[model samples]
Target: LTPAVTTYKLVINGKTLKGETTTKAVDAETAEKAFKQYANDNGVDGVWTYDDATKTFTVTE
Candidate 1:
């Protein structure tokens, strides 16, 4: 069996762009924070959210 791959998206000027982590399924909280931190570290203009259900990271800036 294969481990599920996770993906992320970024929102800018009403458009949604895809972002990727070079790396999860540890836990919901950790996943959320990781994406949040990733965006933050990238120095995005705004905020973010994560769905463990969809394995999606949505960033708003």
Candidate 2:
């Protein structure tokens, strides 16, 4: 069996543009956690919001 692949949208530093970059995860839960960690790693202190319908993660500074 193949593991489910989820493409997660990321909004960093108020950038909403897509197609330039994307992050993939095994599942929704893992995606959320990884996004948060990514924010910390990049020193981004923005608010992270996830849209279940769109599978997008928006980080607003």
Candidate 3:
């Protein structure tokens, strides 16, 4: 049987983030941090939060 594909969402703080790609999931934590870095590099001032339970990141704007 084929393994199930995992789905994830990118979020910072509490809001859902967009632009996440399958390649982004190098690892759950790393992916989350990368998303945060992208936001920061893009001039967004906020914190990132990743929920393992939901496999999503919550972003604060």
Candidate 4:
């Protein structure tokens, strides 16, 4: 049997967007898309980048 895996919704500007993505599973390319989409949907402008070594996503205005 396999346990159900839980995914997390990406959060921005104190809001949680629909859809879930695995933590650390988002690469640079996907991170950019997700971030841009979130910003656009929320009527903002920004960019996002993922640092694999740090396992962190940084956002820029």
Among all candidates shown, the one with the greatest lDDT: 2
Error of 2 at 58 (Å): 1.1
Q: Which window of ten consecutive residues has the lowest lDDT sum in model 4?
A: 1-10
For residue 20, give model 2's deviation from the true position in Å: 6.2
Candidate 2 segments exceeding 4 Å error:
1-3, 15-20
- Candidate number that wins on lDDT, 1 or 3: 3
Q: Count the clashes in each prediction.
A: 0, 0, 10, 0
Query: What are the lDDT figures for the candidates, one per model?
Result: 0.50, 0.63, 0.55, 0.45
lDDT per residue as tens, model 4, 1-61: 1113322234343334433333322345555565566666757456544444534444444
Task: Provide TM-scores for the models.
Answer: 0.50, 0.59, 0.49, 0.37
Query: Candidate 3 at 61: error in angstroms?
Result: 3.3
> 49 in model 1: Cα distance from truth in Å?
0.5
Tens digit per residue, CA lDDT, model 1, 2-52? 144443432322246554552354555555666566667767646566445
Return the clash pairs for model 3, or none: 11-57, 11-58, 11-59, 12-58, 12-59, 12-60, 13-58, 13-59, 14-58, 14-59
Which candidate number maximizes TM-score? 2
Q: Note the residue pairs that clash in candidate 4.
A: none
lDDT of 3 at 55: 56
Error of 4 at 46 (Å): 4.0
After aligning candidate 1 to the native by TM-score, how far in Å is the CA of 37 from where it should be?
1.8
Query: Taking the tens digit of each residue's C-alpha lDDT, what string does model 2 give over 1-61?
Result: 1138857676565455433235788876777677778777867656766665655665666
Stretches off by above 4 angstroms in model 4 are: 1-26, 47-53
